[PDB]
């Protein structure tokens, strides 16, 4: 035995292309649409819960994941690759930051760590690149609210608003017309729901849509009282009912 | 770890990776070495395809390995730095354990050994570099000039050249260098070295570098104007 | 591609067979064993007249009682010589005696098949190992990259080997003197060399019980070349 | 076994070229152009972001210009993710040197170290090289203001003015034409922006498509200041030099 | 075309070795079904003993992973037992480290993560199996969680696996469309097994003897398999109404 | 194509062709069988006499594991020995930690997991043997057969090698004609007959019969070779049935 | 063809070509014979020279006072395998004060060769061995193939033209097995056996190599004028 | 490095004309506490060897498992496992002696003193000693611990040198051994009344006697 694949499986072709990265981006293109919009007082990330079977309980499959109390993530592409990246991202937030500085990392630096992991799967021996693009939304004291996209290559970019996957080209055009620097969080949620409806074929309700926000601190979700400086997580996943309430004012 | 045998024999008994490393040397800028009666001169070609270069800080082609030995090369520039660093470390290690600086032959034998090792070790490619190593042994006034190549073979030379168009300048040296009477002075040796490069170089401007090494750690690099005076005198004798 | 340790359909290791081809391109080396000593001779083959030929080192001392000549990719021989010298000295340290010529040769040949995916390829050089010990007297061995070694009364390796070996077949007998062997190596080297043989492009050496391993001066060899010329003109 | 699938990233071609290095250089030729110009009183770094969007958050964005320490900065051309791996290594090397000798690392020593790391990936390990070319702008008290470049081969060279990325042939000709030795920073700022304006593949050169930086002794008395320009500051210098 | 031999991307962004592992899944020609009751989770699977020289008691694709968790496998037996041994080791280690029984959904995630690694690392091949984990979880109640060679997993109200999974799936879908609830509203596990067998008979259009089936039942604090005589009693009750 | 050049590669069918090619080496080997009786198991194997120069009864093929398990195999003999060596290590570590001798089903999985592991990577070759093994433990007699894929099941009777079809048919008759069961001494006699009958597929060269058994009443649950008078009695019974 | 690039690949008919190619190296090797009675065991080997100036390659290697072998094929591989046998014989004596049984020595050689046929990167051994010995159960002769197959025999031969000697031993079986307490006659039978494999060349004084082990006879090798008695 | 916890006392033995005899009591002491009263310290290996062990009982149980494994291993691929290639007393001793010396050389000894008694293939008597230090020696009589000081003097009166062995019958030898065990019970505070005795004879084989008791004792003179 032993892993005898100690050589790169991603290499430059004569034209300068890194084939395996391009092919990973193609897998992302086939993936279900997900989006993110930044407001003045928050950020929203959303996607469709494309259920593989009606016998499947789609609530047990989480496409939108909490990374830290103030940082959340969504994806387009290969689900299993995303799941392991969320596990690694949660751990690296602790090992390379919280266990050193006694606080959670700022959004840009956690994004940087996830990007590094994705870059290494593009150069290390005997592995393929991750077949996902991530959208990471978060808040921290000194940088405020932010939204980042991370690609299979490991490259990352900050966005005011964006979309990835199936109908991203049409969705990004829709977002360009609606986005301004004076949006409140509720306005951004409204725009998110409008944008997402275009790429969804079948049912469009709280049970088929997954949506989360980075907004105000939620002391009701902290689990304890007594420490004034601890005010609760800014990440909150909207319920099925909360989504449907905003679909009547749609 | 990556263990793949990159340097292997072919049916005709050739190791192509070593032979292709020589082709990288053929592409590199020309280097020449000439030993006189009491000195050795190292000449190097600078391709003038790159102007707007900062010549103060750009890596120079001749490198001191110790205060008494120098090394020049033709081939991959990045590869040569690894050989130069290893040679410099070994030179200090030799002083530390033997309490005497390296002989020119010893330093050559070490660098050549490193090059050979990279031709039958797994997971590595050969160095795309040939070197000219020159200097004087401690407390000795006899000039020394050696050559190494990617395969790891080395030998001593009265005069030698490596790199692009080295076939032409070797032709010149073979008819102009007399063994019974080598260039008796520094002037004569530098003149013969500049002459040999002028067969190949183009403009005698910032394209020719000259370094003179004398006994007892006396090493100096000639400036543009000093070399320009040799270039001037050579062609004025040629107009006849 | 294909394994470095692969067998051919004929039952031979590809890489070993290919290294033997590299040795055929090497400069000639000849050895002759007599009851008065063993002689070793080589063709230097300088690539240019500006190359100082006395820096070409194709005959090498392993110990006082063992010498060695090489042919092929001569850079590959350096680690083999290093190992041989270390083995000879180490045995003297452990046993307070000289090592047998055969035992030294066997130790060198143990390195040969240590390649795979250890070193990445076989050695591209063949060795003639000559020496003397009390048990078996004057000996000459031929060490190959296959790991096999044969003892020889006389042997030639390199580019002019099959022509030289046919010549050694006719000339060798069990009563040869050391002087006769010296001239015989010179005669056969002169026959197979491209350039005209002189003291600067050829080198002689010998191993005797009394004086041990010695590389001959260019002045000493020059006299033997002159002695050869005169005796060939004598009939 | 596994040999079947090995691309062999560290071999010579019959012509004596390194396949992967050559192909990595081909990749870099499609990256946004980065320019460095060295003057007597400072250094300029100018670089073009690749076809952006109106929804990109520019003021928090960085893809071209990176700080290595207080005295040295780099301009990137190639894979951004690859560059950040090397940049972090370079930042650590600078701090290692500062801890060991209690002096800031000389520019060339940092450049040589990163270049040696790139070289290693071309000779051993069987891994793909880094698809990155750097322009190093820095200052130390030995050589003063210095410009270097390094590429995937691990070769590095010093420059008075240099470009990497797209359209380097056109850019280098324009720089060679207008550069003079007695030039000052304010003149060099103008040359860098004028060169990018002519070589760009975009229709017009605007503030949102640029990253800009200067290293000046325009810091109060014998010391050096790095200035990573803000979006509004790039907009102002574009108006000042008469490009918009 | 070596992108088809190892787990690297094809130009279409596909992993062919993963897709071919899904095909190996149906090599046994066996169909399985899982449903949830009020207090239990039932899993049934076809049993085929084609050789008379075989000892039929040793032919099984249902595994007792822990006291609480059961696992049925769709795919070749060597890969099935590989996955079974690992799942047993993981469940035991979990209890030792964290002081409570490994939940069904957590074990499914863990095995799914292991599968994901085989799709990304070249030296390891995917296992040609689909794993259906069942239990009555102390927090979530009756649970069905299914893993595949892509590293995908999800919870189910009910599920089916095998060559004729679609027929069984649609049959189950139609029943839950009528009842409008996420489970079989029945008190005893015996009647939930009877429901499971009845609806497999309806979907496949075949009758079963006691030796043609294999049944596993999960209740609070234990998972167990039924004997041939326990299944016979189940078949008799089905025929008598 | 090219899917059959490397181990652990799935073909578009979902097949591992290298494992299927290992089966061909098994089918090329000599015939070996196993019979499960009332309180134990019997193993028998065909040994081809390639030459008169082979010393009779010396080249023993059946192998013991621990003191209660017997193993026989058809195909590449060295591969079988490698598998038995591993089995002996597995049985030793089990007994070291748990005191009791390894149960037969437990032992079966240890061999199974090891053989299956040689289908997971391209750096190893699958086993070129099918192994028939078993013995007596606390729950009674057990007989198993293990294939190159790692697949194994429990058996009433088992056969592998060049004459497996002939042997299987004979075993199926015994199962039908004896639902109550077969005695250990009967099973030895029947094993001799079946090997003699299966030798028709290898009729060119003559052969040597080798039998072993584990029985609760006849061998105290220990593995023993059938020797001397009991072996000759079985040879006579076999020779009588073919004529 | 497409399945002979390495030892880790079966062919579609279930063959291992690298092992078969290693077997071919033995057939190119010089002939060597092995035979035994109930008191003694004998090896006879035809040594091969490179030319008339060269020595004749040694074929027989001593492993212990009671055991040794003869080789045919790659000689360095025989050195590796014989070194391993020397160590195993030695381990048995030092740890258990016990002379290693010849049958157990065969089992150890089989297992060592097998590992080189199932793993990537390695290669099969390219040599065949004939092991003779005298232990607690009398005289023994073994034949080793680098496939891993080891076989106990009364007599055999391996190498080029070994079929002639093997047929002779098959005829003489009933005669030479009875040569008890007469070492010279058992060697005569072995020298007569190896003669059935000679063509153009005959057995000379530096050509022939003989080894013997028995009841009160340590493993000893005869070369040179010591075999002139049998020419 | 450790300390012995549960321990066994003397093992005694001697040669006679046709074989060897060995004996040891059935106690496992816990310091001065006579804790375990049914411990067998003579362990037969086949039908030709008996290994007697004193010292640490946990280490004794480990050695017992090594010997059990040795028999299993010897039977592997060995058609003559119950004949010419059976385990000899000399093989069993040399193996144990190797282990003991290796363990002391790693500074982690098996805290025991061991006597291997048996008869070889050719009928020769085998009797040799080995301990925690790897020290070995042979003698017509051998004893460990207290036995060395009290049993040997009595047993040496029967067989004083090699030439006394053929003159010593099995009845005389057993009588001497049994008397020595009584003397040890009188005088060793870590001994018990109950003991085991084993005879290995070249004609009658291995006779293993359990549940023997020290009898014919004198106290009456308690004056």
Range 90-149 of C in CB contact (< 8 A) with D? 117
Choose, out of A2, A3, A5, A6, the residue to mutate when testing the contact with B (most B CBs < 10 Å): A6
Asked if the Cβ–Cβ distance from B156 to C55 is below 8 Å, we say: yes
E48 in contact with F, Cβ within 8 Å? no
Chain D nearest CA to F122, separation (Å): 5
Half-sphere CA count of A149, side-chain side, radius 13 A: 23
Of G21, G54, G74, the CB nearest to C151: G54
Give the Cβ contact number of residue H139 at 10 Å: 18
Task: List, in order of start, the domains of chain C with CATH numbers.
Answer: 1-235 (3.60.20.10)
Distance linking the first and last C-alpha atoms of chain G: 46
Choose, out of F53, F114, F122, the residue to mutate when testing the contact with G (most G CBs < 10 Å): F53
Residue B226: φ, ψ to 5°: -65, -45
Least CA distance to F5: which residue of chain D? Answer: D1
F112 in contact with E, Cβ within 8 Å? yes
Which chains share 3+ C-beta pairs under 8 angstroms with B? Answer: A, C, D
Distance linking the first and last C-alpha atoms of chain F: 51
Least CA distance to H74: which residue of chain F? Answer: F66
Please enumerate in sequence order all residues whose Cβ is within 8 A of that of G65, keeping only pairs 6 or more positions apart, or say none.
G218, G219
Of B4, B5, B152, the CB nearest to C75: B152
Least CA distance to E124: which residue of chain D? Answer: D2
Task: List, in order of start, the domains of chain D with CATH numbers.
Answer: 1-244 (3.60.20.10)
Chain D nearest CA to E2, separation (Å): 7
Structure tokens at B73: 């090369």
Is there a contact between D137 and D215 (Cβ–Cβ < 8 Å)?
A: yes
Of the candidates G125, G111, G144, H72, which has an alpha carbon nearest to the alpha carbon of residue F85?
G111
Is there a contact between E31 and E160 (Cβ–Cβ < 8 Å)?
A: yes
Task: Identify the helix (H) or strand (E) that includes residue F40.
Answer: strand F40-48
Quickly name the fold that domain E1-241 has: 3.60.20
Q: What is the 3-state secondary structure (H, E, C) of chain G?
A: CCCCCCCCCCCCCCCCHHHHHHHHHHHHCCCEEEEECCCEEEEEEECCECCCCECECCCEEEEECCEEEEEEECHHHHHHHHHHHHHHHHHHHHHHCCCCCHHHHHHHHHHHHHHHHCECCCCCCCEEEEEEEEECCEEEEEEECCCCCEEEECEEEECCCHHHHHHHHHHHHHHHCCCCCCHHHHHHHHHHHHHHHCCCCCCCCCCEEEEEEECCEEEEEECHHHHHHHC
Asked if the Cβ–Cβ distance from D84 to A116 is below 8 Å, we say: yes
Task: Identify the helix (H) or strand (E) that includes residue H35.
Answer: strand H33-36
Is there a contact between F46 and F30 (Cβ–Cβ < 8 Å)?
A: yes
Of the candidates E63, E74, E39, E226, which has an alpha carbon nearest to the alpha carbon of residue E159?
E74
Q: Where are the domains of chain E?
A: 1-241
Chain G nearest CA to H210, separation (Å): 30
Of F60, F64, F92, the CB nearest to H75: F64
Asked if the Cβ–Cβ distance from F60 to H79 is below 8 Å, we say: yes
DSSP classification of residue A161: E
Give SS3 for D144.
Answer: strand
Q: In what order do the strands lie in the sheet with E158-161?
A: E158-161, E32-36, E41-46, E213-219, E222-225
**b/e per residue, H9-39, with b = 16+ CB within 10 A?**
bbbbbbbbbbbbbbbbbbbbbeeeeeeeeeb
Method: X-ray
Of the candidates D191, D179, D178, D177, which has an alpha carbon nearest to the alpha carbon of residue D241?
D191
Handedness of CA E205, E208, E212, E218 (dihedral sign): positive
Of A30, A53, A83, the CB nearest to E116: A83
Rounded to whole angstroms, how far apart are CA atoms C140 and C151? 6
Structure tokens at F44: 């028998």
User: G and H: touch, per 3+ CB pairs < 8 A?
Assistant: yes
Rounded to whole angstroms, how far apart are CA atoms G229 and G184? 10
A129 in contact with E, Cβ within 8 Å? yes
Rounded to whole angstroms, how far apart are CA atoms C113 and G76? 8
Asked if the Cβ–Cβ distance from A54 to E173 is below 8 Å, we say: yes
User: H and A: touch, per 3+ CB pairs < 8 A?
Assistant: no
Rounded to whole angstroms, how far apart are CA atoms B5 and E43? 53
Please enumerate in sequence order all residues whose Cβ is within 8 A of that of A35, keeping only pairs 6 or more positions apart, or say none.
A45, A46, A47, A135, A161, A162, A163, A164, A171, A175, A192, A195, A196
Of G103, G107, G114, the CB nearest to F79: G114
Task: List, in order of start, the domains of chain A with CATH numbers.
Answer: 1-250 (3.60.20.10)
Tokens 């300029």 locate to D44
Distance linking the first and last C-alpha atoms of chain D: 61
Least CA distance to E3: which residue of chain D? Answer: D5
G98 in contact with H, Cβ within 8 Å? yes
F122 in contact with D, Cβ within 8 Å? yes
Please enumerate in sequence order all residues whose Cβ is within 8 A of that of D133, keeping only pairs 6 or more positions apart, or say none.
D25, D28, D31, D76, D77, D78, D149, D150, D151, D152, D164, D165
Residue C91: φ, ψ to 5°: -65, -40
The neighbouring-strand residues paired with B74 are B130
Asked if the Cβ–Cβ distance from A4 to F123 is below 8 Å, we say: yes
Is there a contact between F90 and F107 (Cβ–Cβ < 8 Å)?
A: yes
Asked if the Cβ–Cβ distance from B6 to C75 is below 8 Å, we say: no
Rounded to whole angstroms, how far apart are CA atoms A76 and A82? 9
Half-sphere CA count of G176, side-chain side, radius 13 A: 28
Q: Name the E strands within chain A.
A: 34-39, 42-48, 56-57, 65-68, 71-77, 132-140, 144-150, 156-158, 161-164, 209-214, 235-237
Structure tokens at F207: 């052969």
Asked if the Cβ–Cβ distance from G53 to C169 is below 8 Å, we say: yes
Give SS3 for B156.
Answer: strand
The answer to whether F31 is a known catalytic residue is no
Structure tokens at H117: 């008694």
Rounded to whole angstroms, how far apart are CA atoms A99 and F84? 50
Domain that residue H134 falls in: 1-223
Structure tokens at B201: 């170089």
Rounded to whole angstroms, how far apart are CA atoms C56 and B156? 8
C175 alpha-carbon distance from chain centroid? 22
F150 in contact with E, Cβ within 8 Å? yes
Rounded to whole angstroms, how far apart are CA atoms C120 and B148? 22
Structure tokens at F62: 């059946």
Rounded to whole angstroms, how far apart are CA atoms G8 and C117? 14
Helix pair angle (E189-204, E165-179), 10° resolution: 130
- Which one of H1, H7, H144, H207 is the catalytic residue? H1
Asked if the Cβ–Cβ distance from C21 to B119 is below 8 Å, we say: no
Half-sphere CA count of D69, side-chain side, radius 13 A: 22
How do the residues of chain A divide into helix, strand and coil, expressed in percent and rounded to 5? 35, 25, 40
Handedness of CA F227, F228, F230, F232 (dihedral sign): positive
List chain D residues with CB under 8 Å of E2. Answer: 4-5
Rounded to whole angstroms, how far apart are CA atoms F64 and F77? 15
Task: List, in order of start, the domains of chain F with CATH numbers.
Answer: 1-243 (3.60.20.10)
DSSP classification of residue F155: B
Give the Cβ contact number of residue F34 at 10 Å: 29
Calculate the CA dihedral of residues F51, F57, F63, F66 and round it to 10 degrees: -160
Asked if the Cβ–Cβ distance from D4 to E2 is below 8 Å, we say: yes
The number of folded domains in chain B is 1
Task: Identify the helix (H) or strand (E) that includes residue B113.
Answer: helix B104-117
Q: For chain D, which residues lie within 8 Å of any Cβ of chain G, measuring from their own Cβ?
A: 1-2
- For the domain that residue B115 is a member of, what is the CATH number? 3.60.20.10
Asked if the Cβ–Cβ distance from D2 to G121 is below 8 Å, we say: no
List chain G residues with CB under 8 Å of H95. Answer: 95-96
Range 125-164 of F in CB contact (< 8 A) with D? none
Which chains share 3+ C-beta pairs under 8 angstroms with E? Answer: A, D, F
Give the Cβ contact number of residue H203 at 10 Å: 9
* Strand bridging mode C149-151 / C154-157: unpaired
Task: Identify the helix (H) or strand (E) that includes residue E170.
Answer: helix E165-179
Rounded to whole angstroms, how far apart are CA atoms E156 and E171? 15
Chain C nearest CA to D3, separation (Å): 7
* Strand bridging mode D223-228 / D65-67: unpaired
As a whole number of Å, the CA-based R_g of chain B is 18
Least CA distance to D80: which residue of chain A? Answer: A155
Chain G nearest CA to C42, separation (Å): 19
- For the domain that residue G117 is a member of, what is the CATH number? 3.60.20.10
DSSP classification of residue E10: -
Please provide the size of chain A in residues: 250
Asked if the Cβ–Cβ distance from C150 to G57 is below 8 Å, we say: yes
As a whole number of Å, the CA-based R_g of chain E is 18
Of the candidates A117, A122, A118, A133, which has an alpha carbon nearest to the alpha carbon of residue A31?
A133
Of the candidates A17, A24, A5, which has an alpha carbon nearest to the alpha carbon of residue A164?
A24
The number of folded domains in chain G is 1
């Amino acid at each position: 035995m032993t892993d005898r694949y100690s050589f790169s499986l991603t290499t430059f072709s004569p034209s300068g292309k890194l084939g395996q990265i391009d092919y990973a981006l193609t897998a992302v293109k086939q993936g279900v649409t997900s989006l993110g919009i930044k407001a003045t007082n928050g950020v929203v990330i959303a996607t469709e819960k494309k259920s593989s079977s009606p016998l499947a309980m789609s609530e047990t499959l989480s496409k939108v994941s909490l990374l830290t109390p103030d940082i959340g993530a969504v994806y387009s592409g290969m689900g299993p690759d995303y799941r392991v990246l969320v596990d690694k991202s949660r751990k690296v937030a602790h090992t390379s930051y919280k266990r050193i500085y006694g606080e959670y990392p700022p959004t840009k630096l956690l994004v940087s760590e996830v990007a590094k992991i994705m870059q290494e799967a593009t150069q290390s021996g005997g592995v393929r690149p991750f077949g996902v693009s991530l959208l990471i939304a978060g808040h921290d004291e000194f940088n405020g609210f932010s939204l980042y996209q991370v690609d299979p290559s490991g490259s990352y970019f900050p966005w005011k608003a964006t979309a990835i996957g199936k109908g991203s080209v049409a969705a990004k055009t829709f977002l360009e017309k609606r986005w301004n620097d004076e949006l409140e969080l509720e306005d951004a949620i409204h725009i998110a729901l409008l944008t997402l409806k275009e790429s969804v074929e079948g049912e469009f309700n709280g049970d088929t849509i997954e949506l989360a926000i980075i907004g105000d601190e939620n002391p009701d979700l902290l689990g304890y009282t007594g420490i004034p400086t601890d005010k609760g997580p800014r990440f909150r996943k909207l319920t099925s009912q909360e989504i449907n309430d905003r679909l009547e004012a749609l | 770890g990556y263990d793949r045998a990159l340097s292997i024999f072919s049916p005709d008994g050739h190791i192509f990776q070593v032979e292709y490393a020589l082709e990288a040397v053929k592409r590199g800028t020309c280097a020449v070495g000439v030993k006189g009666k009491n000195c050795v001169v190292l000449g190097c070609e600078r391709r003038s395809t790159l102007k707007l270069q900062d010549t103060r800080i750009t890596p120079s082609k001749v490198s001191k390995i110790d205060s008494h030995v120098v090394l020049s090369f033709s081939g991959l520039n990045a590869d040569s730095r690894i050989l130069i660093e290893k040679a410099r470390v070994e030179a200090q290690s030799h002083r530390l354990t033997l309490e005497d600086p390296v002989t020119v032959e010893y330093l050559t034998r070490y660098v050549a050994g490193v090059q050979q090792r990279y031709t039958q070790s797994g997971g590595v490619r050969p160095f795309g570099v040939s070197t000219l190593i020159a200097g004087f042994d401690p407390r000795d006034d006899e000039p020394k000039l050696y050559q190494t190549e990617p395969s790891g073979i080395y030998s001593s030379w009265s005069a030698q050249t490596i790199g692009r168009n080295s076939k032409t300048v070797r032709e010149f040296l073979e008819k102009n260098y007399d063994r019974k009477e080598p260039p008796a002075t520094v002037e004569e040796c530098v003149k013969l070295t500049v002459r040999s490069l002028l067969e190949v170089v183009q403009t005698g401007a910032k394209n020719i570098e000259i370094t003179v090494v004398k006994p007892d750690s006396d090493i100096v690099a000639l400036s543009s104007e000093e070399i320009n005076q040799y270039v001037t005198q050579i062609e004025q004798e040629k107009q006849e | 591609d294909r394994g470095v340790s692969t067998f051919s359909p004929e039952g031979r290791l590809f890489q070993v067979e290919y290294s033997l081809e590299a040795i055929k391109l090497g400069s000639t080396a000849i050895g002759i064993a007599t009851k008065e000593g063993v002689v070793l001779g080589v063709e230097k083959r300088a690539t240019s007249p500006l190359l100082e030929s006395d820096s070409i080192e194709k005959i090498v001392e392993i110990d006082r009682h063992i010498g060695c000549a090489m042919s092929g990719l001569t850079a590959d021989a350096r680690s083999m010589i290093e190992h041989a010298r270390t083995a000879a000295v180490t045995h003297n340290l452990y046993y307070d005696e000289d090592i047998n010529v055969e035992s030294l040769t066997q130790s060198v040949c143990d390195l040969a098949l240590r390649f795979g995916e250890l070193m990445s390829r076989p050695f591209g050089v063949a060795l003639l190992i000559a020496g003397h010990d009390a048990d078996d007297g004057y000996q000459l061995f031929h060490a190959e990259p296959s790991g096999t070694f044969y003892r020889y009364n006389a042997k030639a390796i390199g580019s002019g080997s099959e022509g030289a070996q046919a010549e050694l077949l006719n000339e060798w007998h069990s009563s040869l003197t050391l002087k006769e062997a010296e001239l015989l190596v010179l005669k056969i080297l002169k026959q197979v060399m491209e350039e005209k043989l002189d003291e600067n492009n050829a080198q002689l050496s010998c191993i005797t019980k009394q004086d041990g391993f010695k590389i001959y001066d260019n002045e000493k060899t020059a006299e033997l070349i002159k002695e050869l010329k005169e005796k060939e003109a004598a009939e | 076994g596994s040999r079947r699938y090995d691309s062999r990233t560290t071999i010579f071609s019959p012509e004596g070229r390194l396949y992967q290095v050559e192909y990595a250089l081909e990749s870099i030729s499609h990256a946004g152009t980065a320019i460095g110009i060295m003057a007597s009183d400072g250094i300029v770094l100018a670089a073009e972001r690749k076809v952006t969007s109106t929804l990109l958050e520019q003021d928090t964005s960085t893809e071209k210009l990176y700080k290595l320490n207080d005295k040295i900065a780099v301009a990137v051309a190639g894979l951004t993710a690859d560059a950040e791996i090397l940049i972090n290594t370079a930042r650590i090397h600078a701090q290692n040197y500062l801890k060991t000798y209690n002096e800031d690392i000389p520019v060339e020593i940092l450049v040589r170290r990163l270049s040696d790391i790139k070289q290693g990936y071309t000779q051993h390990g069987g891994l793909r090289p880094f698809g990155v070319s750097f322009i190093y702008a820095g200052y130390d008290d030995r050589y003063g203001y210095q410009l270097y470049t390094s590429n995937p081969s691990g070769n590095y060279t010093g420059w008075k003015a240099i470009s990497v990325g797209a359209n380097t042939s056109a850019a280098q000709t324009l720089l060679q034409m207008d550069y003079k030795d007695d030039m000052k920073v304010d003149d060099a700022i103008e040359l860098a922006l004028k060169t990018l304006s002519k070589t760009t593949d975009s229709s017009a050169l605007t503030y949102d498509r640029l990253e800009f930086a200067t290293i000046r002794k325009g810091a109060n008395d014998g010391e050096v200041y790095q200035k990573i320009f803000k979006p509004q500051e790039i907009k102002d210098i574009l108006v000042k030099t008469g490009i918009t | 075309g070596y992108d088809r031999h190892i787990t690297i991307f094809s130009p279409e962004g596909r992993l062919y070795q993963v897709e071919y592992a899904f095909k190996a899944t149906n090599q046994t020609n066996i169909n399985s079904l899982a449903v949830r009751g009020k207090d239990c989770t039932v899993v049934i699977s076809q049993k085929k003993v084609p050789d008379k020289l075989l000892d039929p008691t040793t032919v099984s694709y249902i595994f007792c992973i822990s006291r609480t968790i059961g696992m049925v496998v769709n795919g070749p037996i060597p890969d099935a037992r590989n996955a079974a041994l690992r799942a047993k080791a993981e469940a035991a280690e979990f209890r030792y480290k964290y002081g409570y029984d490994m939940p069904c959904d957590v074990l499914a995630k863990r095995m799914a993560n292991l599968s994901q690694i085989y799709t990304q690392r070249a030296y390891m091949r995917p296992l040609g199996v689909i794993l259906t984990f069942v239990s009555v979880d102390e927090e979530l109640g009756p649970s069905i969680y299914k893993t595949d060679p892509a590293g995908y997993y999800v919870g189910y109200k009910a599920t089916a696996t095998g060559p004729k999974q679609q027929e069984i799936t649609t049959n189950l879908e139609n029943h839950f469309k009528k009842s409008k609830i996420d489970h079989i509203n029945e008190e005893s596990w015996e009647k939930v097994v009877e429901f499971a067998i009845t609806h497999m008979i309806d979907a496949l259009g075949t009758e079963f003897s006691k030796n043609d089936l294999e049944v596993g039942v999960a209740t609070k604090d234990k998972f167990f398999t039924l004997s041939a005589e326990n299944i016979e009693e189940r078949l008799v009750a089905i025929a008598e109404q | 194509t090219g899917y059959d050049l490397s181990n652990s590669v799935f073909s578009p069918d979902g097949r591992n062709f290298q494992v299927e090619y290992a089966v061909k080496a098994v089918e090329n080997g000599t015939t070996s069988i196993g019979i499960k009786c009332n309180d134990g198991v019997v193993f028998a194997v065909e040994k081809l006499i390639t030459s008169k120069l082979l010393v009779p009864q010396k080249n023993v093929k059946i192998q013991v594991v621990d003191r209660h398990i017997g193993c026989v195999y058809s195909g590449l003999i060295p591969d079988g020995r490698h598998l038995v060596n591993r089995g002996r290590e597995e049985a030793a570590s089990f007994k070291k930690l748990y005191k009791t001798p390894i149960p037969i089903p437990a032992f079966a999985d240890r061999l199974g997991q090891y053989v299956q592991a040689h289908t997971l990577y391209n750096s190893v070759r699958p086993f070129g043997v099918s192994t028939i093994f078993g013995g007596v433990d606390k729950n009674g007699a057990h007989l198993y057969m293990l294939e190159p894929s790692g697949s194994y099941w429990g058996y009433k009777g088992a056969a592998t090698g060049k004459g497996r079809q002939s042997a299987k048919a004979e075993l199926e008759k015994l199962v039908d004609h004896h639902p109550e069961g077969l005695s250990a001494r009967e099973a030895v006699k029947q094993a001799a007959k079946i090997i003699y009958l299966a030798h028709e597929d290898n009729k060119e060269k003559d052969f040597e019969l080798e039998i072993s058994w584990c029985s609760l009443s006849e061998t105290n649950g220990l593995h023993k070779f059938v020797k001397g008078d009991l072996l000759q009695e079985a040879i006579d019974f076999a020779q009588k049935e073919i004529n | 063809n497409n399945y002979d690039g390495d030892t880790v690949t079966f062919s579609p008919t279930g063959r291992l070509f690298q092992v078969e190619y290693a077997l071919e190296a033995i057939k190119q090797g010089s002939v060597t014979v092995g035979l035994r009675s109930n008191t003694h065991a004998v090896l006879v080997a035809l040594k091969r020279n490179a030319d008339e100036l060269s020595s004749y390659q040694k074929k027989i290697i001593k492993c212990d006072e009671h055991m040794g072998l003869s080789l045919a094929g790659l000689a360095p591989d025989a050195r590796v395998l014989s070194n391993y046998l020397r160590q195993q014989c030695n381990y048995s004596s030092l740890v258990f004060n016990r002379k290693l049984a010849v049958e157990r020595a065969g089992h150890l050689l089989c297992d060592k060769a097998q590992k080189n046929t199932q793993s990537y990167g390695g290669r099969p051994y390219g040599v065949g061995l004939l092991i003779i010995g005298y232990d607690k159960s009398g005289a023994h002769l073994l034949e080793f193939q680098p496939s891993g197959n080891v076989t106990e025999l009364y007599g055999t031969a391996i190498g080029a033209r070994s079929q002639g000697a093997k047929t002779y031993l098959e005829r003489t079986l009933d005669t030479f097995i009875k040569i008890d307490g007469n070492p010279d006659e058992l060697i005569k039978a072995g020298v007569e056996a190896i003669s059935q494999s000679l063509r153009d060349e005959s057995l000379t004084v530096d050509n022939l190599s003989i080894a013997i082990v028995g009841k009160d006879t340590p493993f000893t090798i005869y070369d040179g004028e010591a075999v002139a008695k049998y020419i | 490095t450790q300390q012995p916890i549960v321990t066994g006392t003397s093992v005694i033995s001697m040669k006679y004309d046709n074989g060897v005899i060995i004996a040891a009591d059935n106690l496992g002491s816990y310091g001065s506490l006579l804790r375990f009263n049914g411990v067998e310290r003579l362990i037969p290996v086949g039908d030709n060897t008996v290994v007697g062990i004193s010292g640490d009982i946990s280490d004794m149980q480990h050695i017992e498992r090594l010997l059990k494994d040795l028999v299993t291993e010897n039977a592997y691929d060995n058609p003559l496992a119950d004949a010419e290639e059976a385990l000899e007393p000399s093989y069993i001793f040399e193996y144990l002696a190797t282990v003991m010396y290796q363990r002391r050389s790693k500074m982690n000894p098996l805290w025991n003193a061991i006597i291997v008694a048996g008869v070889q293939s050719n009928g020769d008597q085998f009797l040799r000693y080995v301990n925690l230090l790897g020290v070995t020696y042979s003698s017509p009589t051998l004893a460990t611990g207290f036995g060395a000081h009290m049993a040997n003097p009595l047993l040496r009166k029967v067989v004083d040198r090699e030439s006394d062995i053929p003159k010593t019958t099995v009845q005389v030898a057993e009588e001497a051994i049994v008397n020595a065990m009584r003397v040890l019970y009188y005088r060793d505070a870590r001994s018990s009344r109950n003991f085991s005795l084993a005879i290995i004879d070249k004609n009658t084989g291995l006779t293993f006697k359990k549940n023997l008791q020290v009898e014919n004792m004198k106290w009456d003179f308690a004056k």
